[PDB]
């Protein structure tokens, strides 16, 4: 796990509308294990489902994504989970919507 990464700069403000942790994958419509992109805030399924967030990474280059299952943040380039106070707000907003 990383306490910081050089890609945290890419994290954009949480949408004013907030987050929807039950939002379907934008490609396959599944609800199983979705992630939200911390740059564009599109929602796509994890790599153990249909890999649409991975596809999104491939298309966009956006580095950091947040899990709607356990609120872990993954950096595709660092290939690691990253935890940092820069992510405090987004994780809280997700948590509040979830519970």
């Amino acid at each position: 796990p990383l306490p910081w990464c050089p890609h945290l700069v890419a994290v954009c403000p949480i949408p004013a509308a907030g987050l929807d942790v039950t939002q379907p994958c934008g490609d396959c419509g599944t609800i199983q294990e979705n992630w939200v992109c911390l740059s564009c805030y599109q929602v796509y399924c994890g790599r153990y489902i249909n890999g649409h967030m991975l596809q999104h990474h491939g298309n966009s280059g956006h580095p950091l994504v947040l899990s709607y299952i356990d609120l872990s943040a993954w950096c595709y380039y660092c290939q690691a989970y990253v935890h940092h106070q820069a992510l405090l707000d987004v994780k809280n907003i997700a948590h509040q919507n979830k519970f």
């Binding site: 943040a73 993954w74 950096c75």
Partner: peptide, 4 residues
């Protein structure tokens, strides 16, 4: 347990 790989993310993303």
């Amino acid at each position: 347990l790989r993310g993303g």
